[PDB]
Amino acid sequence: PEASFQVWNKDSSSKNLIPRLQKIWKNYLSMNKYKVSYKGPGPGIKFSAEALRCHLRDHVNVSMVEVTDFPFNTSEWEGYLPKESIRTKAGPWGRCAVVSSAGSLKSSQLGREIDDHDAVLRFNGAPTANFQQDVGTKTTIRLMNSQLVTTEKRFLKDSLYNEGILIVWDPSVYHSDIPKWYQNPDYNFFNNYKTYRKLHPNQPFYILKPQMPWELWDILQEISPEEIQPNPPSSGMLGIIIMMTLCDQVDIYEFLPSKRKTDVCYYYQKFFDSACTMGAYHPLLYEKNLVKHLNQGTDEDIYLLGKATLPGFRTIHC
Numbered sequence: 001p002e003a004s005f006q007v008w009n010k011d012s013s014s015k016n017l018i019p020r021l022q023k024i025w026k027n028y029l030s031m032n033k034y035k036v037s038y039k040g041p042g043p044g045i046k047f048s049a050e051a052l053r054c055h056l057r058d059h060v061n062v063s064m065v066e067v068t069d070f071p072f073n074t075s076e077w078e079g080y081l082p083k084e085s086i087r088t089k090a091g092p093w094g095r096c097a098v099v100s101s102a103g104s105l106k107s108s109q110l111g112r113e114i115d116d117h118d119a120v121l122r123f124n125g126a127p128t129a130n131f132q133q134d135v136g137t138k139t140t141i142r143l144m145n146s147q148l149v150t151t152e153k154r155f156l157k158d159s160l161y162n163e164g165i166l167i168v169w170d171p172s173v174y175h176s177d178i179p180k181w182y183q184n185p186d187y188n189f190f191n192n193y194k195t196y197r198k199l200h201p202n203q204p205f206y207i208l209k210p211q212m213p214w215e216l217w218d219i220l221q222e223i224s225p226e227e228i229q230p231n232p233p234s235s236g237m238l239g240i241i242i243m244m245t246l247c248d249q250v251d252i253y254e255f256l257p258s259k260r261k262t263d264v265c266y267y268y269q270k271f272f273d274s275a276c277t278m279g280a281y282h283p284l285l286y287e288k289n290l291v292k293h294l295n296q297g298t299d300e301d302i303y304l305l306g307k308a309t310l311p312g313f314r315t316i317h318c
């Protein structure tokens with residue numbers, strides 16, 4: 001016969017969420033903090049996986065703030081941003097791993113497998129020490145939100161941040177260009193970016209262009225059967241797209257969750273919240289639908305290992 005097991009449902013909706021998470025999604029729609037007005041193709045468009053993969057290659061620009069982008073060409077900013085492109089400094093690589101921060105990484109023993117990739121991408125303050133067996137020890141790129149850089153005092157102390165390439169991102173007003181956003185960042189991480197950058201010059205540290213998250217959101221909203229959270233996508237999803245541009249093959253672990261699915265938010269923290277898995281602020285739900293939809297692994301890989309495989313843009317047909 002055939003195996004009857006539940007891996008991530010590609011067509012999940014608000015009407016598949018707990019009431020408590022349903023309310024939170026409604027509230028975020030009202031707020032519209034970032035002044036989103038989706039005027040793209042009506043939500044609910046059906047894309048092939050190959051087709052949607054090209055769409056993401058073509059309509060999402062993965063670029064870092066360069067010295068040529070006004071106003072990072074002004075004197076006050078001179079000598080802060082890294083000289084060469086991130087593409088130059090990072091790879092290209094064959095097989096890469098994106099490690100979510102999910103609590104379901106607990107007792108996964110995924111460490112050795114994670115470390116057999118050329119590069120590993122982690123998020124925010126996700127630690128490696130004490131968790132190597134489940135989580136690995138290698139950190140090649142670390143993606144952080146601007147809130148952490150701005151307000152986490154440990155960002156300028158903990159050695160964990162001192163490994164590999166750093167990238168920071170900050171949500172901007174919807175469809176904003178670089179100068180307007182510089183005026184109105186969601187968190188003013190600019191001082192601390194300059195401050196860290198003074199302390200670790202030989203550590204590459206980039207700033208994601210503010211447009212990248214929204215260009216991705218537009219695609220999310222185009223696919224989704226309903227209106228999604230008017231907030232930018234989660235760090236996890238950005239980290240995936242980033243790696244798809246740096247690798248030929250990206251493995252994502254415990255994003256689409258395994259059989260160890262749990263309310264425990266992080267592998268490295270002891271608190272529960274279903275929202276970290278199912279989404280609150282971020283349209284994480286619809287991000288997961290997209291990953292499942294582009295998965296080139298089997299369902300069995302998801303259930304047992306929490307593992308999803310996407311091809312790098314470098315390798316696709318168009």
Ligand SMILES: *[C@@H]1O[C@H](CO[C@H]2O[C@@H](C)[C@@H](O)[C@@H](O)[C@@H]2O)[C@@H](O[C@@H]2O[C@H](CO)[C@@H](O[C@@H]3O[C@H](CO[C@H]4O[C@H](CO)[C@@H](O)[C@H](O)[C@@H]4O[C@@H]4O[C@H](CO)[C@@H](O[C@@H]5O[C@H](CO)[C@H](O)[C@H](O)[C@H]5O)[C@H](O)[C@H]4NC(C)=O)[C@@H](O)[C@H](O[C@H]4O[C@H](CO)[C@@H](O)[C@H](O)[C@@H]4O[C@@H]4O[C@H](CO)[C@@H](O[C@@H]5O[C@H](CO)[C@H](O)[C@H](O)[C@H]5O)[C@H](O)[C@H]4NC(C)=O)[C@@H]3O)[C@H](O)[C@H]2NC(C)=O)[C@H](O)[C@H]1NC(C)=O
Nearest residue numbers: 055056057058059060061062063209211212214215216218
């Ligand atoms: C992402 O990102 C990206 C990028 O960004 C960036 O990138 C970089 C790299 C660069 O590029 C920069 O720039 C950018 O920014 C993006 O993309 C983009 O986008 C945009 C849009 O939006 C675009 O723009 C456009 O452009 C064009 C062109 O340009 C050029 O130049 C420039 C400088 O600046 C550059 O940049 C570019 O690239 C180009 O270049 C080119 O290249 C090419 C290649 O590709 C080349 O080729 C070559 O060459 C050589 C030598 O020659 C040889 O030949 C070989 O073979 C080849 O191959 C070339 O050379 C070069 N050059 C040229 C020029 O070509 C422009 O044009 C445009 O403009 C237009 O349109 C617009 C809209 O859009 C408008 O507004 C304007 O106005 C115009 O229009 C026009 O107008 C005029 C008047 O004014 C008219 O005229 C008329 O006409 C008639 C007849 O017809 C008559 O005659 C009369 O009399 C008159 O008047 C006309 O018509 C019109 N037209 C129409 C159509 O309408 C624009 O500006 C760009 O390009 C892009 N880039 C890229 C790269 O792609 C994106 O978008 C992003 N994404 C997102 C999503 O966001």
Ligand SMILES: Nc1ccn([C@@H]2O[C@H](COP(=O)(O)O)[C@@H](O)[C@H]2O)c(=O)n1
Nearest residue numbers: 100101102123124234235236265276277
């Ligand atoms: N339970 C969890 C916890 C985190 N994550 C992913 O890991 C990423 C990193 O988590 P933080 O952004 O909270 O540091 C999230 O943006 C999300 O994509 C998840 O998918 N499930």
